[PDB]
């Protein structure tokens, strides 16, 4: 109940810190679809896909690690609100094409990262 909390926070902080570091150094390189926010969403996409597969195969994995990796790392590493203002701005700057693209590349890109990581581990294990 508090050991759980501590899990959300270590995972979360490592996730948020990592996003921050990748966003501030790489987002400015490509305004129309800033690569920092894309990559972290994809990365978490990938990672939680592999956890779909791993958790399934390891039902007795400690809840503390499950919570830390998912709600923790992947929750705090990924981000909807930033994706959401980037798109909002592209819409206000009348750049609809890239508002639309950004929305697709994040959604599909992420589903695919999740498909990838999951199908890679349900083949590497069985």
């Amino acid at each position: 109940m508090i050991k759980s909390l501590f899990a959300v926070i270590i995972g979360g902080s490592v996730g948020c810190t990592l996003r921050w570091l990748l966003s501030t150094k790489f987002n400015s390189l490509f305004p129309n679809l800033p690569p920092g926010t894309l990559v972290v969403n994809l990365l978490a996409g990938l990672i939680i896909g592999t956890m779909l597969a791993y958790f399934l195969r390891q039902p007795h994995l400690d809840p503390f690690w499950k919570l830390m990796i998912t709600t923790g790392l992947c929750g705090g590493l990924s981000t909807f609100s930033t994706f959401s203002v980037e798109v909002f701005a592209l819409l206000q700057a009348g750049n609809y094409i890239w508002a639309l693209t950004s929305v697709l590349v994040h959604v599909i890109g992420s589903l695919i990262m999740t498909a990838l990581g999951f199908f890679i581990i349900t083949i590497l294990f069985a």
Binding site: T24, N27, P31, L90, G94, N95
Partner: protein
């Protein structure tokens, strides 16, 4: 680490009472451009309008013939970790 300030501010066409200016947009998501213009020779005072970030040109009109004007431009842009903010201005002089 990227400049949000427009570059190459220039008058492109001119009539005795109007100016067409163009600039190069900064590599940054610009929502709109603020354009200011007033008479270089002291108090006139300075007038302001905005232009959609799409555009990189603007028409200033309703000016006096044979007068020195100061024209400046800065951007209302989006960036990560500042969200919506304003840039430094770029600036030129043109005598009608």
């Amino acid at each position: 680490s990227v400049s949000s300030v427009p570059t190459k501010l220039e008058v492109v066409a001119a009539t005795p009472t109007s100016l067409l200016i163009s600039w190069d947009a900064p590599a940054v998501t610009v929502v709109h451009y603020v354009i200011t213009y007033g008479e270089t020779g002291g108090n006139s005072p300075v007038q302001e309008f905005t232009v959609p970030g799409s555009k990189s040109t603007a028409t200033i009109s309703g000016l006096k013939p044979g007068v020195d004007y100061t024209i400046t431009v800065y951007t209302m842009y989006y960036s990560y970790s500042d969200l919506y903010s304003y840039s430094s201005p770029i600036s030129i002089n043109y005598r009608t």
